[PDB]
Amino acid sequence: TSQVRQNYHQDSEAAINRQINLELYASYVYLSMSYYFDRDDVALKNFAKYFLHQSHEEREHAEKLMKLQNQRGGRIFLQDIKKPDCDDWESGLNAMECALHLEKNVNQSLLELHKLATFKNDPHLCDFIETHYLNEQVKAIKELGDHVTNLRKMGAPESGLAEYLFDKHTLG
Amino acid sequence: TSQVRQNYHQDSEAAINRQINLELYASYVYLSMSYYFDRDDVALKNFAKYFLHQSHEEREHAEKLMKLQNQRGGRIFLQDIKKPDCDDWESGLNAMECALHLEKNVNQSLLELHKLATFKNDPHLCDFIETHYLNEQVKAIKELGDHVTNLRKMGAPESGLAEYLFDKHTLG
Amino acid sequence: TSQVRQNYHQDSEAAINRQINLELYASYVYLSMSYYFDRDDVALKNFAKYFLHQSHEEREHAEKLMKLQNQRGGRIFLQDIKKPDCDDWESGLNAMECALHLEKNVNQSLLELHKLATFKNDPHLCDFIETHYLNEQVKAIKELGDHVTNLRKMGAPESGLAEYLFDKHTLG
Amino acid sequence: TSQVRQNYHQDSEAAINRQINLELYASYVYLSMSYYFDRDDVALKNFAKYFLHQSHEEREHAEKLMKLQNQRGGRIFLQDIKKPDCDDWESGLNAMECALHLEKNVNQSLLELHKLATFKNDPHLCDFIETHYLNEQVKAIKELGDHVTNLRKMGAPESGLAEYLFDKHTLG
Ligand SMILES: [Fe+3]
Ligand SMILES: [Fe+3]
Ligand SMILES: [Fe+3]
Ligand SMILES: [Fe+3]
């Protein structure tokens, strides 16, 4: 056992390793979405910037969790990162809704991790999660809500002008 | 009786207290409107900016009359700040129209003060209303009229595109 | 129902709405205190500055709570802001004593609000209160108790010198 | 008759000359008060600089009215500047209460002058009094009232320590 390990239950260790996988998965979904909007037949390059930047942020989330795992004396076990559920994301509003849906899954997973950490009386782990993940799930979910709503009210996905104007004025 | 009081009728002091409660109420309406446009199913960030600024500006008006109450030797007596009429403001256009109605009422009230203070031969009080309040109201009314007109022409409130663009290109 | 709402209970949404009102009321109490010390027969700029600053901070607390409500997908419902209890706050010491009382009641509301968030397993809400509200109350309470201590030891409210010199040296 | 007179009554010219004389008198009262506090047996150096400042402001008020008299085409007529009622002003608190009484008398004089300008329908002479003299009198009376109030609670005039600290912290 690790000379640093203190108050770090192996269920919390197991859960952090599968949160690490979900954060890498999330980053890969976003990578897929970003380069979808790069396509010459979609061509929304602020949608592409937006999802690429969320792709990088979600990789920082993974490494933070991996750093946490070593800080606490657990051992990273990496898993396959599954390909995203869709090669084709259909529209800007559809990707935004898929992202909002992904972000709610990721957040549900973080709420479970926190419930477990709470059950395991790991206040450093709870604080770690509250400090670095919980509010930025709320913030990202709220921001995608904002985005989904404006896109709908602008007349997406049926309107091509809606996704264009949103791309320049909200995402530029 | 106040050692500074001079030519300050008890009727003007009571009227000043009433206007203070109007200005606080106006502040509260605008606060209400602002965080409506911050909802995830309205999501108009600069409509929300605009009204929150108005709310702070109204709070300045209230405080300036309380300064005046004291400068003249009157005594401040505050009342309840009633909640605004609506919790839901329907749309950007309807909010602007409500705000336009509220400004004309506040103007009505200030013109009544001025009239009273004329009746009571209070030339310093008449100049105070004129210098700090009356032309602020003509400006605010003329602005909300400008906004109300533009949103109507753009096709608000049926057209979600209209309010989206107005928020970016006028309230931004 | 709201597309961003996740793990946000009805009960917690109601409390936030009540806390918004309490913060608004405390902003109003401090404003009443501010212009009491602006009076010609009271005359203490620094008590009045101190309290106006607190009125404005409390206004900021109330707005961050409305930002949260929207962030989490709940709905703000504003109510009347009650007038404060006193019109004459008697003395600088007595205002400091009532301000201390107000801050402890607001803390009681925040502690109860945090406890409900625990009960509903809202770890994000819990973190929100800890970060922005709980230590603010503990500092605000300690500062106010320090002020009452010095005002009493100086001879207040009997001594007009006591309060005059505190106004210059502590609040300057 | 002056090539520049228009809507300027014989009575208004005469009341301006009366007001010039009053401002010169008030400057002369403050100068007397100034060097009372410069005496080796009063020795309140900031009371003296305060009242020399007031004395010089009053000299500027008189000059502004002489400039107005010539702006409207009326003719300046100077009278004796009577000596102040007092050579000995007894105490700083006493000098302030007397100053308060002076600025209320000069105010009542300016209110009667604005009433006359109204009587004669001189909107320029009215606004001149409003812009330049009315709010200054309201502020001078309030500030003196504040000083009188603080001196009293501090224990003036029986407390020489009070007048000394007042001179340091308020007036220095
Ligand atoms: Fe994440
Ligand atoms: Fe106003
Ligand atoms: Fe607070
Ligand atoms: Fe003067």
- How far apart are the termini of chain A? 50 Å
Radius of gyration of chain A, in Å, reads 18 Å
Q: Can you tell me the overall shape of chain A?
A: elongated
Most residues in contact, chain pair and counts: B-C, 32 and 31 residues
Notes on the structure:
The PDB classes it as oxidoreductase. The entry lists the keywords protein assembly, oxidoreductase. Crystal Structure of Human H-Ferritin variant 123F assembling in solution2. By secondary structure, chain A is an all-alpha fold. In chain A, 72% of the residues lie in helices and 0% in strands. Chain A has five helices and no strands. In chain A, α1 runs antiparallel to α2 and α3 runs antiparallel to α4 (123-153). The termini of chain A are far apart. The relative contact order of chain A is 0.16. Chain C binds chain D through residues 40-43, 160-161, 163-165, 168, and chain D through 142, 145-146, 149-150, 152-155, 159, 162, 165, 169-170.
Topology overview:
The structure is cut from a larger assembly and holds four copies of chain A (172 residues).
Chain A: H1 10-37, H2 45-71, H3 92-119, H4 123-153, H5 160-169
Helix pairs in contact in A: 1-2, 1-3, 3-4
The complex binds fe (iii) ion (4 copies).
Tags for this model:
part of a larger assembly; 4 chains; 172 residues; elongated
Short précis:
Chains A, B, C, D: This is Ferritin heavy chain. With 172 residues, chain A is mainly alpha-helical. The first copy, chain A, has helices at residues 10-37, 45-71, 92-119, 123-153, 160-169.
